[PDB]
Design a protein around this nucleic acid. Structure first.
Ligand SMILES: [Cl-]
Ligand SMILES: [Cl-]
Ligand SMILES: [Cl-]
Ligand SMILES: [K+]
Ligand SMILES: [Mg+2]
Ligand SMILES: [Mg+2]
Ligand SMILES: [Mg+2]
Ligand SMILES: [Mg+2]
Ligand SMILES: [Mg+2]
Ligand SMILES: [Mg+2]
Ligand SMILES: [Mg+2]
Ligand SMILES: [Mg+2]
Ligand SMILES: [Mg+2]
Ligand SMILES: [Mg+2]
Ligand SMILES: [Mg+2]
Ligand SMILES: [Mg+2]
Ligand SMILES: [Mg+2]
Ligand SMILES: [Mg+2]
Ligand SMILES: [Mg+2]
Ligand SMILES: [Mg+2]
Ligand SMILES: [Mg+2]
Ligand SMILES: [Mg+2]
Ligand code: NA
Ligand code: NA
Ligand code: NA
Ligand code: NA
Ligand code: NA
Ligand code: NA
Ligand code: NA
Ligand code: NA
Ligand code: NA
Ligand code: NA
Ligand code: NA
Ligand SMILES: [Sr+2]
Ligand SMILES: [Sr+2]
Ligand SMILES: [Sr+2]
Ligand SMILES: [Sr+2]
Ligand SMILES: [Sr+2]
Ligand SMILES: [Sr+2]
Ligand SMILES: [Sr+2]
Ligand SMILES: [Sr+2]
Ligand SMILES: [Sr+2]
Ligand SMILES: [Sr+2]
Lengths: 46, 194, 119, 237
RNA sequence: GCUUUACUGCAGGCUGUCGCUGAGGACUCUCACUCCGGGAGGAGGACACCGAUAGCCGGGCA
RNA sequence: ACUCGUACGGUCACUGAAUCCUGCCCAGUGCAGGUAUCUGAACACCUCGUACAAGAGGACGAAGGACCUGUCAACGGCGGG
RNA sequence: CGCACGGAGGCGAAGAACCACAGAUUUCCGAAUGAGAAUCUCUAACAAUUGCUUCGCGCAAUGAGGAACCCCGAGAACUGAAACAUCUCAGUAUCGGGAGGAACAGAAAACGCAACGUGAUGUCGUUAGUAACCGCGAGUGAACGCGAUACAGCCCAAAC
């Protein structure tokens, strides 16, 4: 499949959203990413 | 003494008699080749126009509109309906042809507001009406004492809300007493029984 | 055209519009169809002018029969703008009236006679 | 029930439409002012997909390249003339007034200058009979006497591709190919072989029509099937 | 869901009538209107179309 | 839409290559044509009625029906004595 | 020094944080308006429809949104009638168009406790399940008046 520049920016954002909650937030909040998406298990838009 | 206007009026009492009979037979031939909504520089019935609110001023536009004669252009039921609701041929619309004309005109002129309208005859298959429209944004109207009321925000889209004279008459608002129980203050406030 | 039953020659019209220009500077003239109608009704009309290019024709339609039932003579002018300038206005006029002429009474009298001879 | 096949037809969908894009030309007569001074040489003889008959490619004196409904005998290099003072030869188009009686014509017009309506199919011809100042009676291929205007243009000769009907299709595959170039749905399923919901003749335990096949002219679309307003049926009697 | 000479109705078709619509129970005409023609113009013509209504048919449909 | 189409066309149906063939029936039903006469709505028109109106009746009478004819490769029929 | 309590660091007595008002900035798509496009792209833009017009997009207007409310149009069926067709559900559901902060209505060709009477309009209470409708079945269903709320009356067309 041939993706456009806008589609590429969106996929790029979704890849970044797929990172975990950093070590320091856990300590700052005294203690989970609910938007964890897998390439196989979950489906993205478009 | 009689006004010159009273002669245009007396002529239109019988549009199938005299010199007007000959005039209509001629005009309608050009009108049939004209569009749905046609802007005319001067009103065909000067007396009626002036009586309805027209003035030879800047921002006072007039236009002729042709609408089809007859009942509703209805489709037959595609689903189940009881006998009463199975009609097509005898069903008529609740808005008169004049009101259909005023709306078609107002849509053609999205900036202008409908003042009033009048009939200018009919042939075998269509009816013609001339609608007087006003520019609520021209200072020639914003300063005119006899017309500046139409510039107010609550007069916007007056024809689509039935605030025209032809609108109010069609809504059953003529009589102030008996018969107007289900019509005044509005049809929608009375449950739609008028 | 529905009210026009006789064609007025280009020269007879010139004689008429010249008589109107000197009628305003001496006696009195009425400008506009309403004022023309009230002249024929009050009898104060000597010679009434009517334009041929009036759209709509209803505004003027009545003048030929109204003049014929009041004895008042009438004449046709081709253009609306020429009659208006003749009455002394920047804007055109559909109809004008000569209410008591002046130093044109001899000309107006002959024009009224020339039109009757033209039927 | 459901709408019958003849009702789906009128909707004008892909399945029912003619392959217009694959068609060559709208075979109409040329327009002459008067005088007749319009002529041309035949460049080629092509096949018209719309009628299964040949069509002549003619080039005119005024640079105009157009395809024309070719009668029999027309070839490459032949000179055809169109107009009032045209020669009484095959392939030339002139009004019925100028054409002599008893001469087979094709591509006849209904109203003058329309382009040609009658006698246009493979090998058919109209026969010009009577002459007048008012009426020119033409006998159309159906055997009908059409009273026409003498100013109606017609091409001389019989239409080309005669006797096409003679050879049988033999196999369904041949009918398939022909049908693919027309505006028709093929194959035909008999109504009597359908369900009650689908056709007036559908239903039953055995295949037979429900009511008599002959239907009234006044019948509504959805009921008007079988033998439409038949004056009679059968061969005998 | 389907059927029909079940009950009741609704489209659709045919037909009379009214309007458009005009000049001189059969008939002429040209000007509305219609169609053909690029056009000049040709054909048709107060009919047809369309709007309204009336009778007949009308499991096509509810 | 059919249709860049025009009866050697294309629409609507039945039968279902070839070969030998395809009888009799039009009373009913359907379709179609005709029709003296009969039947046949509304508008206009005429009588009555009403100072008008409702309404009652009459004359004229379209398609349709009656009646007559054609038609079964049209629905279908082809027995008892 | 947001939620958010870490680590490093920083800002604040030049009065920060914080709150109120006002202003600056305010990518792309979006009514989306130069044209095209799944938020990007291609070579000056009120696109489209209008009004006025120096007839030049020069000056303006419309478009779209909004919790419901409001006004103008289109308009069911289940259901009830112990079936069902009128009736009923109901001018409801739903659909098309549109306004405002409220809408609509509104200064009698009214009423008609008939009078020597009332006096623009909405709305609330009542009149009243009354009059009226209806296979006169099931069901349907006002008004004048009265008591209140609030009150406010005017402009053209024509004559001259
Ligand atoms: Cl408006
Ligand atoms: Cl074939
Ligand atoms: Cl009272
Ligand atoms: K029901
Ligand atoms: Mg990663
Ligand atoms: Mg209200
Ligand atoms: Mg052709
Ligand atoms: Mg065959
Ligand atoms: Mg095909
Ligand atoms: Mg088959
Ligand atoms: Mg089967
Ligand atoms: Mg069926
Ligand atoms: Mg069988
Ligand atoms: Mg069979
Ligand atoms: Mg055409
Ligand atoms: Mg049924
Ligand atoms: Mg078989
Ligand atoms: Mg853009
Ligand atoms: Mg029930
Ligand atoms: Mg009961
Ligand atoms: Mg009710
Ligand atoms: Mg009352
Ligand atoms: Na996936
Ligand atoms: Na508007
Ligand atoms: Na009502
Ligand atoms: Na029979
Ligand atoms: Na048998
Ligand atoms: Na902002
Ligand atoms: Na704008
Ligand atoms: Na401009
Ligand atoms: Na029940
Ligand atoms: Na039931
Ligand atoms: Na009822
Ligand atoms: Sr998967
Ligand atoms: Sr608006
Ligand atoms: Sr002027
Ligand atoms: Sr053509
Ligand atoms: Sr053609
Ligand atoms: Sr069957
Ligand atoms: Sr036989
Ligand atoms: Sr029979
Ligand atoms: Sr905290
Ligand atoms: Sr008061």
């Amino acid at each position: 499949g041939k993706k456009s520049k806008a589609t590429k920016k969106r996929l790029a954002k979704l890849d970044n959203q797929n990172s975990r909650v950093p070590a320091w937030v856990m300590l700052k909040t005294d203690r989970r990413n609910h938007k964890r998406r897998h390439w196989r298990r979950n489906d993205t838009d478009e | 003494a009689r006004s010159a206007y009273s002669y245009i009026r007396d002529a239109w009492k019988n549009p199938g008699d005299g010199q007007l009979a000959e005039l209509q037979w001629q005009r309608q031939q050009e009108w049939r080749n004209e569009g749905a909504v046609e802007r005319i520089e001067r009103p065909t019935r000067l007396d009626k126009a002036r009586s309805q609110g027209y003035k030879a001023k800047q921002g006072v536009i007039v236009a002729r509109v042709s609408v089809r004669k007859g009942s509703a252009r209805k489709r037959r039921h595609k689903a189940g309906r009881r006998s009463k609701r199975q009609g097509v041929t005898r069903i008529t619309r609740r808005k008169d042809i004049q009101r259909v004309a005023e709306e078609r005109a107002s849509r053609t002129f999205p900036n202008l507001r409908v003042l009033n309208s009048y009939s200018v005859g009919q042939d075998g298959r269509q009816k013609w009406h001339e609608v007087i429209l006003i520019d609520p944004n021209h200072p020639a109207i914003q300063n005119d004492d006899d017309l500046s009321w139409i510039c107010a925000d609550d007069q916007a889209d007056r024809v689509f809300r039935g605030l025209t004279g032809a609108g109010r008459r069609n809504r059953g608002l003529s009589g102030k007493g008996k018969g107007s129980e289900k019509t005044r203050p509005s049809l929608r406030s009375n449950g739609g029984k008028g | 055209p529905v009210y026009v039953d006789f064609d007025v020659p280009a020269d007879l019209e010139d004689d008429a519009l010249e008589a109107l220009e000197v009628a305003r500077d001496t006696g009195a003239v009425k400008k506009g169809t309403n004022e023309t109608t009230k002249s024929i009704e009050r009898g104060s009309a000597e010679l009434v002018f009517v334009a041929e290019d009036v759209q709509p024709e209803e505004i003027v339609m009545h003048i030929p029969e109204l003049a014929d039932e009041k004895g008042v003579p009438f004449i046709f002018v081709e253009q609306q703008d020429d009659l208006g300038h003749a009455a002394g206005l920047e804007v055109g006029s559909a109809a004008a009236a000569v209410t008591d002429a002046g130093e044109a009474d001899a000309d107006v009298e002959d024009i009224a006679d020339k039109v009757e001879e033209l039927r | 029930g459901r709408r019958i096949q003849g009702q789906r037809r009128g909707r004008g969908t892909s399945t029912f439409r003619a392959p217009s894009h694959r068609y060559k030309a709208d075979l109409e007569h040329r327009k002459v002012e008067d005088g007749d001074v319009i002529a041309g040489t035949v460049v080629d003889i092509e096949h018209d997909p719309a009628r299964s008959a040949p069509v002549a490619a003619v080039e005119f004196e005024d640079g105009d390249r157009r395809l024309i409904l070719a009668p029999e005998g027309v070839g490459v290099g032949d000179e055809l003339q169109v107009g009032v003072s045209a020669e009484i030869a095959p392939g030339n188009t002139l009004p019925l007034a100028e054409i002599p009686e008893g001469v087979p014509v094709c591509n006849v017009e209904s109203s003058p200058g329309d382009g040609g309506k009658f006698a246009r199919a493979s090998g058919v011809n109209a026969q010009l009979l009577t002459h007048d100042r008012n009426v020119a009676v033409v006998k159309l291929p159906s055997g009908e006497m059409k009273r026409l205007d003498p100013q109606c243009r017609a091409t001389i000769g019989v239409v080309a591709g005669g006797g096409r009907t003679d050879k049988p299709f033999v196999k369904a595959g041949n009918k398939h190919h022909k049908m693919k170039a027309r505006g028709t749905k093929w194959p035909n399923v008999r109504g009597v072989a359908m369900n009650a919901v689908d056709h007036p003749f559908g239903g039953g335990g055995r295949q037979h029509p429900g009511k008599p096949k002959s239907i009234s002219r006044n019948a509504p679309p959805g009921r008007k099937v079988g033998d439409i307003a038949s004056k009679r049926t059968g061969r005998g009697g």
